[PDB]
């Protein structure tokens, strides 16, 4: 009697934490733009209270408003898009010091890109601008509002 973690409505609140996360420079799912990424991240639905590790989720079974998430392959590796609605907010975990995204002065929404190997291995990406929180590894906690289906 609970909505599982592999079920997202447009309007849910996602609470991702990133145990110690490294900076990427040229991430291809988000164009050619930088990112912080973690190996052992944890995705949380706030309104339902359902918590799950990112690497323990079959990401082909996750649906947004019933329909399946958008997938892209870049250099032979498959990335999954959970589109947000608004900019993704993130900050160093436990510290009030915050970070800001790549399109930090642009009226665009962000997404939440997930690499998935096929087994028990998955990465989680947050679109960033630079190393405003460090070059990594650094604990990051994110916050986003779940968005519409990509047309």
């Amino acid at each position: 009697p609970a909505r599982p973690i592999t079920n997202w409505r447009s309007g849910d609140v996602v609470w991702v934490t990133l145990p110690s996360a490294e900076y990427a420079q040229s991430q291809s799912a988000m164009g050619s733009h930088p990112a912080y990424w973690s190996e052992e991240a944890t995705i949380i639905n706030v309104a339902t209270g359902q918590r799950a590790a990112v690497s323990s989720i079959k990401w082909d079974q996750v649906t947004l408003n019933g329909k399946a998430l958008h997938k892209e392959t870049h250099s032979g590796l498959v990335y999954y898009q959970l589109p947000l609605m608004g900019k993704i907010n993130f900050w160093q975990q436990g510290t009030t010091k915050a970070g800001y995204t790549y399109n930090y002065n642009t009226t665009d929404s962000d997404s939440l890109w997930v690499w998935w190997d096929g087994g028990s291995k998955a990465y989680l990406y947050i679109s960033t601008y630079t190393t405003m929180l460090g070059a990594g590894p650094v604990n990051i906690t994110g916050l986003g509002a779940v968005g519409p289906n990509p047309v």
Partner: antibody, heavy 124, light 108 residues
Framework: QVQLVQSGTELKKPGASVTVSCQAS????????VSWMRQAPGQGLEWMGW????????TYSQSVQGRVTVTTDTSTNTAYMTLRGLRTDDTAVYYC?????????????????WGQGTLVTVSS | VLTQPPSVSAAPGQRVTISCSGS????????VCWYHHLPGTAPKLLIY???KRPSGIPDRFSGSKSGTSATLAITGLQTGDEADYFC???????????FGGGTKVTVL
């Protein structure tokens, strides 16, 4: 474990060209970058330049007058460094590091997982 | 250009403070790193992001940053810590990686 193993010591003449290798292991070589630093006898380290193995994008310093050239072999996971026009004061221990970070205005480069160094002597 | 004291010294068991001094384009807007280097060996990372240790670095080593200055603290100095210690940051004015000068540590 991540290791960087360089080439052996070399002895050149004033005006020759020295090529220093840097073998990599223990990590995905196309994920990170490789820099090159030197150490003159009696001084601290001086940065020379790097490369990014994702696409190939070198960025050298100004104190060297366009004499350095950094290339990579993707198949053998090995990065190179060719210094031409060897002046007498180019005698140094040339180090290899794993470049990682950003150079935009809040910047942070780490240079973790160095290599053991290579002495190059430019004399007669 | 990063400036360091050439030598810092303490008794076994005390603490040392190794400090750099850059400018607003070296350290005031960027994150500094501290390295450990025996002569004739490879340098080893100690502090990144001004205050953070990698795995396998003891709690004795701690760093900080205050404005355009940055200080490496080695609390509880023992034998085996006799090498050079030097900074690294990005200079947005020169568009280059600038290093310190290295600091000798002599155990009394």
């Amino acid at each position: 474990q991540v290791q960087l193993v360089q080439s052996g010591t070399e002895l050149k003449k004033p005006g020759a060209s020295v090529t220093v290798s840097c073998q990599a292991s223990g990590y995905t070589f196309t994920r990170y970058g490789v820099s090159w630093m030197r150490q003159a006898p009696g001084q601290g380290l001086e940065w020379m330049g790097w490369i990014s193995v994702h696409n190939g994008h070198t960025t050298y310093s100004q104190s060297v007058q366009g004499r350095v050239t950094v290339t990579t072999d993707t198949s053998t996971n090995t990065a190179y460094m060719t210094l031409r026009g060897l002046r007498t004061d180019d005698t140094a221990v040339y180090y290899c590091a794993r470049y990682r970070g950003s150079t935009v205005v809040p910047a942070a480069i780490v240079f973790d997982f160095w290599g053991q160094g290579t002495l190059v002597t430019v004399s007669s | 250009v990063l400036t360091q004291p050439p030598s810092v010294s303490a008794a076994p068991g005390q603490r040392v403070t190794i400090s750099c001094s850059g400018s607003n384009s070296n350290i005031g807007h960027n994150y500094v790193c501290w390295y450990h280097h025996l002569p004739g060996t490879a340098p080893k990372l100690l502090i990144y992001d001004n205050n953070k240790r990698p795995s396998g670095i003891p709690d004795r080593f701690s760093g900080s940053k205050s404005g355009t200055s940055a200080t490496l603290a080695i609390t509880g100095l023992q034998t085996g810590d006799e090498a050079d210690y030097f900074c690294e940051t990005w200079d947005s004015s020169l568009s280059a990686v600038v290093f310190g000068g290295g600091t000798k540590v002599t155990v009394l």
